[PDB]
Design a protein around this nucleic acid. Structure first.
Lengths: 226, 215
RNA sequence: GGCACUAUGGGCGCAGCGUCAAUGACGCUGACGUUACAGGCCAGACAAGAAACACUUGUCUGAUAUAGUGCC
């Protein structure tokens, strides 16, 4: 269980840029394993990217990256690298490094995986999100339950972190996936259903946190009446 | 000539206790050089099967791998609440490596109807010149549900974007989001905005709406 | 390119020839002897080595692989 893999080095890059991921083997020696990079485009499945083979240092690449990406290990550092050049947007994914287990114990299965490092390719720039309240119209309360939420609009890139009332009130909370808009920015909205007795008695404030732009927003949600 | 690994089905909706089978076919022979991974959302993949039928470690016995020619199948003998991830096949027989595009395996529950809520834009948001009208479908099952935007009994199109949760853990429901985007000018040109939901749980499509200054 | 014939390890000495040293050591070259013993060479299949390829080792199957000399 001391076996671990840790990726690093991702973030946003313009098209045509370059990014160099690391993968930090702890608990075994990189020297004696095949090491792979697998990416996962957001909303998609797994796509294989590359591998470097032990002893011979022989490498292999995906058809799609064969010429822009380069895999390498530093045995002295117990870290395998990924040199991504001349990035394109469809290179955007979470990138995972994985170890091929021992020939006589797991065949060619990848038995330990990293955590994943996210990499966005975009010529869009950073943007903090604007937080608007979806106010609970207690104008209607049938099952004694109104719905309230925060609209988190026009940010880039993702992720975003939406707590509600600072970690309390986790129950019935539905934060949605972001969606890309024709603008090229993302928008998502988080909601929570609550008793409409406690409407007013309790006060409801969503906790947004978009660290790519260093914005810690807090927005209060409440109706406005006549 | 890459070897393609065509996984099927793309989706699978079962209930606990069921026997489940997921197939994958190699466009050429891969010998038995085939792995199976389970992936739950946000997390890294877990190896389940290596060498097409041998079970990696930590894998319960209900899982099992199978080969027949170029036809590789994972089967779960009796589905458990834990065995509700996406599943991928991989060929490692030649380079470049290949994966299936995955199989999403979802819980099956009783048919639940959506509780429909609708939201005008904010004064803050209209203070800045754009109007987002957001409608909410809450805690229903199954997934497939139509949402129709009428503005003054007129169907809209293309000015709205949907968004759906993953299945809940406790009651294994869904929730869906829809957002009509407008310039603040176009928003102020109309009075009736409506959100029309057709779902199986509804005998008749349920509608929610509002006026412009309605308070 | 084909055919024939001939040669092919390891020590151990012999010579020659080096390099650093500093008259030391170890290489390199012998159809140069000698020899317990045997190997050496090329390729394929399969296995194993922390091992998809490459590398190294083992088993199996073939013969090959070099050079030299003729003839065609």
């Amino acid at each position: 269980s001391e076996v671990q893999l840790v990726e690093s080095g991702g973030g946003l890059v313009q098209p045509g840029g370059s990014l160099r991921l690391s993968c930090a083997a702890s608990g075994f020696y990189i020297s004696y394993s095949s090491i792979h990079w697998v990416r996962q485009a957001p909303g998609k499945g797994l796509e294989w990217v590359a591998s470097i083979s032990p002893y011979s240092g022989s490498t292999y690449y995906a058809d799609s990256v064969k010429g822009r990406f380069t895999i390498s290990a530093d045995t002295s550092k117990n870290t395998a690298y990924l040199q991504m050049n001349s990035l394109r947007a469809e290179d955007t994914a979470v990138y995972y490094c994985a170890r091929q287990g021992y020939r006589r114990r797991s065949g060619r299965g990848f038995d330990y995986w990293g955590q994943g490092t996210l990499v966005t390719v975009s010529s869009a720039s950073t943007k903090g999100p604007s937080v608007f309240p979806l106010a609970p119209s207690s104008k209607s309360t049938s099952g004694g339950t109104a719905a309230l939420g925060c609209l988190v609009k026009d940010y880039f890139p993702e992720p975003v972190t939406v707590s509600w009332n600072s970690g309390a009130l986790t129950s019935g909370v539905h934060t949605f996936p972001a969606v890309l808009q024709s603008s090229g920015l993302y928008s998502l909205s988080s909601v929570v259903t609550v008793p409409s007795s406690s409407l007013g008695t309790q006060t409801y404030i969503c906790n947004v946190n978009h660290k790519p732009s260093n914005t810690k927003v807090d927005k209060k949600v409440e109706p406005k009446s006549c | 000539s890459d070897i393609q690994m065509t996984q099927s089905p793309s989706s699978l909706s079962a209930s606990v206790g069921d026997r489940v089978t997921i197939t994958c076919r190699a466009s050429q022979s891969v010998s038995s050089a085939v792995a199976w991974y389970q992936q739950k959302p946000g997390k890294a993949p877990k190896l389940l099967i290596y060498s097409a039928s041998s079970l990696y470690s930590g894998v319960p016995s209900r899982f099992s791998g199978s080969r027949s020619g170029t036809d590789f199948t994972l089967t779960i003998s009796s589905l458990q609440p834990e065995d509700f991830a996406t599943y991928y096949c991989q060929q490692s027989y030649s380079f470049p490596s290949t994966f299936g595009q995955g199989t999403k395996v979802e819980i099956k529950r009783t048919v639940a109807a959506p509780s429909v809520f609708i939201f005008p834009p904010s004064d803050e948001q209209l203070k800045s010149g754009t109007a987002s009208v957001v409608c909410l479908l809450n805690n229903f099952y199954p997934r497939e549900a139509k949402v129709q935007w009428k503005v003054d009994n007129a169907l809209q199109s293309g000015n709205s974007q949907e968004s759906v949760t993953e299945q809940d853990s406790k009651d294994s429901t869904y929730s869906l989001s829809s957002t009509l985007t407008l310039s603040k000018a176009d928003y102020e040109k109309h009075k009736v905005y409506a959100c029309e939901v057709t779902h199986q749980g509804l005998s008749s499509p349920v509608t929610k709406s509002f006026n412009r200054g309605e308070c």
